[PDB]
Write a protein of this length. Structure first.
Ligand code: NI
Length: 304
């Protein structure tokens, strides 16, 4: 709904996930970067989006959509990746989640249109993957038994503008300050601050990850635990090693995750373009020859 200039739009909270969708992304570190889109530009108008779930929490039921969002609407889609059950080792399980499993077993990134999506586990940084991993690994004798439950919820679909984007004020200042002549290091600094890539569409939502720790010889005496522990979702006996969990999106106040996710999402199942494409359309003439440099540096940066 478009309001009309005589309704105040300060009323409306910005659509959830708006700041996050505006950030660049680094394909190599799997880290987010600084803002690429201007997350708070409204283009002199009041565009609102309906939240049908408002009782669970006009003006209470509508959020404001920044201009750089061509589309945003809410969803509630749930994918449960209940695993395949057995697994001899933990690293094998987490590595084979990425390489060997379908898209409902994790989060995806894809480049461009026909750019087939890459499954990136949970979608944290490479250093965060090696902290959930290092702090996890420590637990076993000589690798016994691991199951995984993983749930993915999409709380919104969105699509970024392709034409006439409003670039973040700071990024535009950084661009304007790069030299006309090619200097790798300086453009590499730009890539580190703003990203390898920026998002053009995807989902808002989150992930809840479980990994059950089972004791071979145990189940022996007394797949089966996975089935049952999935019920516990929807310290005691039972070879209950210790259910380890990872979570993205939502906020405390933990299937309170489910209730709160829509209002505190992260970006998932997203499409992206190399950072330099951001300036290929979208106004700003003079700064073109800086795109060849930015392309060149990106190519070098990714060869690393
Ligand atoms: Ni949709």
């Amino acid at each position: 709904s478009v309001r009309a200039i005589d309704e105040d739009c300060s009323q409306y909270e910005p659509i959830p996930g708006s700041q996050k969708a505006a950030l660049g992304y680094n394909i190599l570190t799997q880290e987010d970067a600084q803002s690429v889109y201007d997350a708070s530009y409204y283009g002199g108008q009041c565009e609102t989006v309906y939240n049908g779930e408002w009782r669970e929490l006009d003006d209470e039921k509508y959020f404001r959509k920044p201009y750089n969002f061509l589309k945003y609407h809410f969803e509630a889609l749930a994918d449960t990746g209940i695993s395949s059950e057995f697994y001899d080792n933990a690293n094998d399980l987490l590595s084979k989640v990425k390489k060997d499993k379908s898209d409902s077993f994790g989060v995806t990134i894809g480049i461009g249109p026909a750019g087939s999506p890459l499954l990136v586990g949970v979608g944290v940084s490479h250093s965060q993957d090696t902290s959930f991993l290092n702090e996890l690994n420590k637990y076993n004798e000589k690798k016994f038994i691991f199951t995984r439950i993983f749930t993915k919820v999409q709380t919104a679909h969105f699509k970024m503008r392709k034409d006439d984007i409003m670039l973040d004020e700071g990024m535009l200042q950084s661009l304007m300050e790069l030299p006309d002549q090619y200097n790798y290091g300086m453009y590499a600094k730009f890539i580190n601050d703003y990203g390898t890539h920026y998002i053009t569409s995807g989902s808002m939502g989150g992930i809840y990850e479980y990994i059950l720790v089972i004791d071979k010889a145990k189940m022996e005496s007394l797949x089966x635990x996975x089935x049952x522990x999935x019920x516990x979702x929807x310290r005691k006996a039972m070879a209950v090693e210790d259910i380890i969990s990872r979570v993205r999106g939502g906020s405390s106040g933990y299937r309170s995750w489910g209730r709160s996710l829509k209002y505190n999402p992260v970006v998932i199942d997203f499409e992206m373009q190399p950072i330099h494409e951001v300036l290929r359309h979208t106004s700003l003439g003079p700064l073109e020859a800086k795109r060849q440099n930015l392309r060149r540096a990106l190519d070098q940066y990714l060869m690393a």
